[PDB]
């Protein structure tokens, strides 16, 4: 029960923003209260519009 | 400036900065952080939360009398 469904749409609308990605950090738990031992992977099309 | 506008995607509440500013239907209205400093007559030296707190404000300010 991790999927956060978040604000980023499909069909642009949306775009992933970076806090999108970050927010996502709190249904890790205190496992992501780290920052050194978690990885990230973003789709493609969440690199592009993180930029 | 398009208050009324924007109040047709977005009704009530404005959203978080960031997801503001990543709805493509919002980028007619406005345009990144330039246009919205340079409306609010705002400048870059005043730091975008400033900015973005009187872009709320005036949402808010703005609602339709009702």
Redesign the interface.
């Known amino acids: 029960s991790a999927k956060v469904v978040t604000e980023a749409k499909a069909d642009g609308s949306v775009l992933v923003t970076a806090k999108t990605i970050s927010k996502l950090r709190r249904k890790l738990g205190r496992h992501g209260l780290k920052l050194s031992k978690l990885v990230l992977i973003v789709s493609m099309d969440a690199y592009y519009d993180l930029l | 400036i398009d208050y009324s506008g924007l109040r047709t995607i977005f009704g009530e509440k404005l959203?978080?900065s960031?997801?503001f500013?990543?709805?493509?239907?919002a980028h007619k209205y406005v345009p990144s952080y330039a246009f919205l400093r340079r409306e609010l007559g705002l400048s870059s030296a005043h730091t975008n939360r400033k900015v973005w707190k009187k872009f709320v404000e005036a949402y808010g300010k703005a609602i339709p009398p009702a």
């Open positions: 959203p978080e960031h997801i500013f990543a709805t493509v239907a």
